[PDB]
């Protein structure tokens, strides 16, 4: 079901001198759920229950997000993909995940998780993904109605929109969820970002890092690398397609549909589909994991 309660108890661990927050419930091989922008582990709260008793259920808050520490001093150069990766790699190392990990990824969680999986392929038992960056993007891949806004994030206007006005949290997030969110749900999403200014920097640095039309070149290269690898990897995959969907449609869906050893289902949703179809998503992931772990 739906519901505004978080899943499990927030745990904390020191990473590179900062505290990062995460959920870690149960025993066995991990099922590792990774949120993107502008969300947190909270995104998965109604999905993780479906995997109860199927393994160790983990959902990390990215640095600067959820209950994880902010990077100080924050600024325009902070919270790049590379910086996020340094923190997340270190947290995942610290968590002692073993060598049969199932990844469940969304949004920037997919860029991070696909890249981690490429680099740690022997440890990856399966990959479930949805509304993901399956390859480097072009503006044509980007949903038409949202192009101007994302272009504005990637311009000098971005600081006013995001740091001052919290547009990613307050506008984009509900705008890409089909059902109305409750007061408690929006409170949970806005909590890490209540303060104007640098507290909100992750939600601006992220759109500035999207690999689109060749920029930023480093993230483009990372996505090119994992795109080629995923299109050849025999690791089992679960693609949760969405209707109408948002990001993983058109050309980039055409591309991920070429990936080997992949099961697909379609659920209702736009981008943050976890808020629209958590039971269908959870049921599919649980079935995938049961097949991987007989
Ligand atoms: Ca909405
Ligand atoms: Cl084992
Ligand atoms: Cl973004």
Deposited resolution, Å: 1.6
- Nearest ligand, CA 179: 1
Task: Name the DSSP class of 161.
Answer: I
From the CA of 36, the nearest ligand is 3
CATH number of the domain enclosing 134: 3.40.50.1820
Phi, psi of 5 (to 5 degrees): -70, 135
Q: From the CA of 11, how far away is ligand 2's center (Å)?
A: 24
100 CA to centre of ligand 2 in angstroms: 7
Distance 239 CA to ligand 3 centre (A): 20
Method by which the coordinates were obtained: X-ray
The DSSP-derived string for 166-189 is: -HIIIIIHHHT-SSPPPHHHHHHH
Q: At what angle do helices 107-119 and 81-94 cross, to 10 degrees?
A: 60
Residue 27 Cα, ligand 2 centroid: separation in angstroms? 12
Angle between helices 217-230 and 81-94 (to 10 degrees): 50
Q: 73 Cβ partners below 8 Å, 6+ apart? A: 198
What's the domain range around 53? Answer: 1-294
User: Is 286 in a helix, a strand, or coil?
Assistant: helix
Strand 56-60 vs strand 101-106: parallel, antiparallel, or unpaired?
Answer: unpaired
Radius of gyration of the chain from its Cα atoms, rounded to whole angstroms: 17
The answer to the question of whether 49 is labelled as a binding residue is no
* Ligand with the closest atom to the CA of 125: 2
CA distance 279 to 29: 22
Compute, in angstroms, the gap from residue 210 CA to the centroid of ligand 3.
Answer: 6
Residue among 210, 138, 131, 141 nearest 176 (CA): 131
Helix (H, G, I), strand (E, B) or coil at 28: coil
The ligand placed nearest to the CA atom of residue 99 is: 2
Give the residue numbers annotated as catalytic, written as ranges.
Answer: 107, 131, 271
137, 210 in Cβ contact below 8 A? yes
Q: Cα(34)–Cα(217) distance, rounded to whole angstroms?
A: 23
Number of domains observed in the structure of the chain:
1
Strands 124-132 and 56-60: unpaired
Ion ligand 1 — residues with CB under 5 Å? 174, 177
Q: Give the Cα separation of 123 and 142 in Å (integer).
A: 32
C-alpha 1 to ligand 1 mean position (Å): 19
Q: Is 177 annotated as a binding residue?
A: yes
d(CA 277, CA 47) in angstroms, rounded, equals 9
Q: Which residues contact 120 (CB under 8 A, 6 or more apart)?
A: 101
The full 3-state SS of 237-267, as one line of letters, equals: EEEEEEEECCCCCHHHHHHHCCCCCEEEEEE
CA atoms within 13 A on the CB side of 166: 16
């Amino acid at each position: 079901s739906l519901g505004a309660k978080p899943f499990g108890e927030k745990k904390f661990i020191e990473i590179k001198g900062r505290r990062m927050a995460y959920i870690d419930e149960g025993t066995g091989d991990p099922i590792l759920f990774q949120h993107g922008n502008p969300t947190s582990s909270y995104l998965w709260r109604n999905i993780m229950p479906h995997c109860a008793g199927l393994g160790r259920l983990i959902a990390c808050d990215l640095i600067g997000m959820g209950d994880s520490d902010k990077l100080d001093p924050s600024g325009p150069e902070r919270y790049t993909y590379a910086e996020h990766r340094d923190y997340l790699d270190a947290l995942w190392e610290a968590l002692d995940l073993g060598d049969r990990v199932v990844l469940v990824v969304h949004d920037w969680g997919s860029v991070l998780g696909f890249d981690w999986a490429r680099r740690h392929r022997e440890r990856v038992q399966g990959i479930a993904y949805m509304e993901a960056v399956t390859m480097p993007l072009e503006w044509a891949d980007f949903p038409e109605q949202d192009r101007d806004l994302f272009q504005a994030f990637r311009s000098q206007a971005g600081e006013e929109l995001v740091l001052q006005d919290n547009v990613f949290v307050e506008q984009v997030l509900p705008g890409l969820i089909l059902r109305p969110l409750s007061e408690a749900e929006m409170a949970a999403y806005r909590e890490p970002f209540l303060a104007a200014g640098e507290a909100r920097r992750p939600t601006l640095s992220w759109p500035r890092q999207i690999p689109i039309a060749g920029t930023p070149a480093d993230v483009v290269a990372i996505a090119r690398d994992y795109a080629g690898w995923l299109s050849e990897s025999p690791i089992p995959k679960l693609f949760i397609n969405a209707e109408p969907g948002h990001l993983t449609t058109g050309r980039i869906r055409d591309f991920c549909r070429t990936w080997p050893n992949q099961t697909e289902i379609t659920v209702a949703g736009a981008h943050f589909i976890q808020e629209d179809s958590p039971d269908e998503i959870g049921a599919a992931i649980a079935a995938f994991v049961r097949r991987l772990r007989p």
